[PDB]
Design an enzyme around this catalytic site. Sequence first.
Site, short mmCIF file in Angstrom:
data_model
loop_
_atom_site.label_atom_id
_atom_site.label_comp_id
_atom_site.label_asym_id
_atom_site.label_seq_id
_atom_site.Cartn_x
_atom_site.Cartn_y
_atom_site.Cartn_z
N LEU D 42 70.68 11.98 -66.48
CA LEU D 42 71.99 11.37 -66.37
C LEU D 42 72.87 11.76 -67.56
O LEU D 42 72.39 11.93 -68.68
CB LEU D 42 71.86 9.85 -66.30
CG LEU D 42 70.94 9.30 -65.22
CD1 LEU D 42 70.82 7.80 -65.35
CD2 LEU D 42 71.44 9.67 -63.84
N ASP D 43 74.17 11.90 -67.30
CA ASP D 43 75.13 12.18 -68.35
C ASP D 43 75.65 10.87 -68.94
O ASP D 43 75.27 9.77 -68.52
CB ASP D 43 76.27 13.04 -67.82
CG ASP D 43 76.91 12.47 -66.57
OD1 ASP D 43 77.31 11.29 -66.60
OD2 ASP D 43 77.01 13.20 -65.57
N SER D 44 76.56 10.98 -69.91
CA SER D 44 77.05 9.79 -70.61
C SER D 44 77.64 8.79 -69.64
O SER D 44 77.25 7.62 -69.62
CB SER D 44 78.09 10.19 -71.64
OG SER D 44 77.51 10.85 -72.75
N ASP D 46 77.32 8.51 -66.41
CA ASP D 46 76.26 7.97 -65.57
C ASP D 46 75.55 6.82 -66.27
O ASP D 46 75.18 5.83 -65.63
CB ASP D 46 75.26 9.07 -65.22
CG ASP D 46 75.83 10.11 -64.29
OD1 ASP D 46 76.78 9.79 -63.55
OD2 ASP D 46 75.33 11.26 -64.30
N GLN D 47 75.35 6.94 -67.58
CA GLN D 47 74.73 5.86 -68.34
C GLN D 47 75.65 4.65 -68.42
O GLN D 47 75.18 3.50 -68.38
CB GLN D 47 74.36 6.35 -69.73
CG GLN D 47 73.47 5.40 -70.51
CD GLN D 47 74.24 4.58 -71.53
OE1 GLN D 47 75.05 5.11 -72.28
NE2 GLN D 47 73.97 3.28 -71.55
#
Lengths: 96, 99, 115, 88, 318, 98, 175, 83, 155, 103, 70
Positions: D42-44, D46-47
């Site tokens: 996951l990317d930022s 997504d987090q």
Amino acid sequence: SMMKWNRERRRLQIEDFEARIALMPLLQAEKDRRVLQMLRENLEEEATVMKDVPGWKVGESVFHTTRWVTPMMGELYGLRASEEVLSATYGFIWYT
Amino acid sequence: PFFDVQKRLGVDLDRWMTIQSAEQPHKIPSRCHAFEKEWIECAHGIGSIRAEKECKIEFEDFRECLLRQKTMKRLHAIRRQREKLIKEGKYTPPPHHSG
Amino acid sequence: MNLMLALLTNFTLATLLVIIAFWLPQLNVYSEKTSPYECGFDPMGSARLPFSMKFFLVAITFLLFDLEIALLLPLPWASQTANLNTMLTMALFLIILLAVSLAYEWTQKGLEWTE
Amino acid sequence: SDAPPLTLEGIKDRVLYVLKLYDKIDPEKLSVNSHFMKDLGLDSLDQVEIIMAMEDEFGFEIPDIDAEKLMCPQEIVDYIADKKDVYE
Amino acid sequence: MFMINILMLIIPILLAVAFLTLVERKVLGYMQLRKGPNVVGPYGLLQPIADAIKLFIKEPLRPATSSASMFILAPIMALGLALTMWIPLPMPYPLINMNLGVLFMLAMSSLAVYSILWSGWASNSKYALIGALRAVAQTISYEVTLAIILLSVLLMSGSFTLSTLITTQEQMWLILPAWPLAMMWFISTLAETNRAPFDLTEGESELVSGFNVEYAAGPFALFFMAEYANIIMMNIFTAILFLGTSHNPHMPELYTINFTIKSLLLTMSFLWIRASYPRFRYDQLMHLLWKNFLPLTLALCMWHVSLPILTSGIPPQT
Amino acid sequence: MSMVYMNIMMAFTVSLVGLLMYRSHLMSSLLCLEGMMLSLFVMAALTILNSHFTLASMMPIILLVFAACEAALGLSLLVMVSNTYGTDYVQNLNLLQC
Amino acid sequence: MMLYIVFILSVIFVMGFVGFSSKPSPIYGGLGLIVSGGVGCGIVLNFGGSFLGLMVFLIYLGGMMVVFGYTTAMATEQYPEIWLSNKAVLGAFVTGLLMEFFMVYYVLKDKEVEVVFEFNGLGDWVIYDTGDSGFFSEEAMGIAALYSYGTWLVIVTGWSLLIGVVVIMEITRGN
Amino acid sequence: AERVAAFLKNVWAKEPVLVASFAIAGLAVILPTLSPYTKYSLMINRATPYNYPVPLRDDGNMPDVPSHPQDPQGPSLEWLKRL
Amino acid sequence: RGEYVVAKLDDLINWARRSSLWPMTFGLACCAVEMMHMAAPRYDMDRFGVVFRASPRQSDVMIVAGTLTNKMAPALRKVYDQMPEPRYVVSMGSCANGGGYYHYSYSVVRGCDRIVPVDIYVPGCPPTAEALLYGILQLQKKIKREKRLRIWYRR
Amino acid sequence: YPTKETAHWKPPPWNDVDPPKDTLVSNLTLNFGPQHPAAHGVLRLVMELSGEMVRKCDPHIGLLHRGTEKLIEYKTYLQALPYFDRLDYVSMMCNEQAYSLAV
Amino acid sequence: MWFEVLPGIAVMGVCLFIPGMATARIHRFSNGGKEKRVAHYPYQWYLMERDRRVSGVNRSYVSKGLENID
Ligand SMILES: CCCCCCCCCCCCCCCCCC(=O)OC[C@H](COP(=O)(O)OCCN)OC(=O)CCCCCCCCCCCCCCCCC
Ligand code: SF4
């Protein structure tokens, strides 16, 4: 101006009410014979509609007293004409 | 009244409207004036317990003049019998009643 | 009877005109035509949100005053009584109290609309 | 009656279930110790979206400074415990 | 022959309402240095016919956010009650000779207010709602005052019968003994009939069109017809109360001539006023009646209960 | 008792049952109180008119007077209820005995 | 038919009470109490009392107007309810109608329904008086009597109304 | 004597409508007491014959009660005609 | 021939519509000033049956008078869509016609006919009140030539 | 006698006054334009009303922004003069005078 | 000029005259050329109801005079 005319109008009303008073004794006499004539007609017919009912005293009262009791609309116009009844009950209220 | 002050002070506050046989404007009588008068005159002074038994006739007559139940039942019986007889071609309407 | 016919005629005539209005014309309905009108831009929030009444206290007073006409409209008939001394006293007493009711609410900032 | 108490095992199901609904995490390799960035990819942002779901799950506000450190499901369960004082 | 009489009443009324639109436009036109309608038919006499047809072949539309059943009831309820106010009016013989005609007109006037409340509420628009609640406020202003003014007048007529107002004024107009009440009655009819400077529910300059901003085509026409039927009807009421004509049983036509002329001039005054003044503010319209008219109306109501007694001028009850 | 008395007494019960069964709005339950007054008014008017009880003809008028002193009073509390909470929901009047 | 006008109006009278008793949005509830107010004014009118019938109708028209202005302020929500938009309001509305229908059915057929009280279905017209009054309205005379006879009633009613104004000023002051 | 004409002139220049109200209301409550025709008003009401005048049984000792409506005995409305 | 009867109903409805045009109270820029002067006593548009009304739902003609900007473009279309049919649009002046003095600007719609269908184009900056009155009287002639009922009959 | 139900009941306030609630009711928001008789055609005046009392006026302008100040940069001092007749289009020669005095 | 307004008022005025005239003539047409009877109070209705019986044609406006008594 408004007071004199109003005062004149009270005298006119008395002359109108007195004329009524001179006639009421005749209208009372007519009304009496009219009701009694209709009470008998209702009584006469009931004799031919309850001629066979065992437990029935024709023309029996419903009150214990023997005083005269003014008949209600249902008694007086028991089975008169349908339009005769409607004007007898609502004739005055509806007349405009 | 819980406190019968009116009797003490001799001031009529609401007894003028308690009964329907009281004095009315222009002496307009009620439909059941005569019956209410007799029940009240029969049952004055003897007290409620006695009037429940000794003035029972004058109160049943009054209760008839009010709701007219014993009268409507009689008319109801005649109407039932009449519609039955007129249903089987046995009742001939009198002239005035219809014509 | 006669009154009933007049009432039935007036409202039947109005209904026919409403029926004719909706069934005579040529129609062309789509979403953007039937949207609410707020001067060209979309309204923000429903017209069913609360709408503050800044004269609520004046409205309640209307109920109490609107009863006085019930007790005052018999006066034309009342004046025909033989006990005019008493009837005159109570008619003025009833109206005077109504004025005292008005003067109390007036002085107490009652008739002033809130903010 | 008084609701059932919050227990560290109860929180754990909530977090994993919320993560399970997320459509970018593959349910196969989502462990209670798996990492959002390195393991799940996951990317930022997504987090950030996951942390928003947790706020809806437990109904309380999470500051941005704290969410910068919730890089795996475990610390989420820890963080929820610290807020509700669920030592268990 | 009664159904023929009803048609002989409502049908001319609609025609009078239609041509009152022309008269207002041509009268306001000349007071404004214009000419008003003069192109559509000679002197504009066909202008009302063009407008009526145009409205009823236009497209009516029910807004998406409306309440259908109430949205259509309001115009029906409006026009129907507007034609109902006319049945008891003596001219010089009323269609329905009501014994309590004055109360009946009071009650129907109140009921007719809900055709405004339900139209504005059923529209589901904010300008439509603002106008609806300016009618609640406007009725709270005049309803009590207008009722008491009628009571004060009726203390010199003797009964609620409308035909008795003719008998009362067989020697002199009621405007003389009661000119202070006529002044406050005329402004009340201005406010009651939602007319300038009291035409606040519609409020073109402030609410685009007010309670009826969402109404088009025929449904709008019914409101327009209802509003003008009240304008004529209330000025006919004013003429009967204060400017009572003389009735000759053998020549009832003469009454209808004098009666109609007085009702026209009183109706022209409504147009005359609308072209002369700015618009009140709907909170000021309330303070005008509760703080100026109500104090004075209560005082005059007392004065008219005592004046007949202290002068022995109580009218007959029948 | 004629067939009309059945409907007026039937109407009074409907209003009575309506009042006792609140839904959510307090204004909805204020109308039922005003509805009960209208039933009693009519029922008294039929009884008094029918028997020609002349002086009693003022009773229904007096009845309306205190019929509205409750409505005025009832609306007064409704203003004070909505001020505290912003709506006239009855479920917000649960501070007492809870 | 026409002889049963009062009964028909009373049926409509009950239907209005079932209307607002179901408790839809007070906008429609206020409408129901206006319809029943009108027909209720008719029933009293057909019994002779025209002043009383018009008075109640007039007083309820004014009162229901104040309720309307309050509904838009304190008793409104995003989706006002109708008699069809709830099962509780729908269930109650259909309940009251059926219970009226079964009473009209049995009274018009059996001619005698006993529920707490005995009711007779012969027709309201059977109890009306036969004779005429004088040169006046009997109910009008009684209402006029409020001042010559009802001195005590005027005083309490006048005092109660005066306090009513004072009371609502205290209650609604707040703070 | 110098402050009575200062309150009155102050209100008359600020509340002309209220002055006309109290002044009119005052005369309604006062003049009926002072009027001499107020007695006639009450007498005309008693003179309006709403009911029927039920006659009396002649016991032989009623010389103040007329035997015919056109007899000298009994109340007369002569004052009314000249009023 | 039955086509004659409909051809005489068309005249009636066409006459009722051109005789009772009701423009919307809609002006944008300097041209709207000359639209007031057409209501002024000298030209008195009201004597041709032309009466302004504020509500879009109570209007028959939109008179686009002035410049239409990209910020105002969505609003103009909405009020047009809210006009019941039949509805007509008159484009007054050069800004409403093709952009006028501001054709090449960045915030101006080059011609109001990109947003709504237009019937009559009135040229000028501003068109004299007499010029606009010529436009309206030309619009009435266009409504007098409609054969709606003669076209429905021949379908 | 605490139970399952009455466990959460709290003692009433010492003085019987409960804390007032937070934001409850919002002012109605209304668009007073641009198609309004009193909005001069191009004034979207977004208002927040409490009934009819005004709580805030937020005039949205730019519905008649045409970029005159940028179109002038592309016009010689004479070609730009007519732009000033169209700024206050009720005072034409008063606008022209200001520009002429400036040049 | 101003007098061009009169045609509109004349047409409007003629429309308010018809209701009054139509009722007056209809009343006399239906009641044998006499004003319609007014019965506001029960005494008035009693006499009117009595004329239906006296007339013998069920019409209360058919007045029977001295020719009817002997
Ligand atoms: C037998 C019974 C008959 C008697 C009836 C008794 C009841 C009388 C009252 C009934 C009418 C209700 C009004 C009562 C309140 C009086 C008005 C009032 O309260 O005004 C108070 C006023 C408050 O306003 P404020 O903010 O102070 O502004 C002015 C600054 N000084 O502050 C003030 O300015 C007060 C000033 C004094 C107010 C004097 C009011 C005089 C009223 C009686 C006048 C009668 C005389 C005229 C009639 C005589 C005949 C011509
Ligand atoms: S066309 Fe001319 S008058 Fe109209 S807005 Fe543009 S510059 Fe101004």
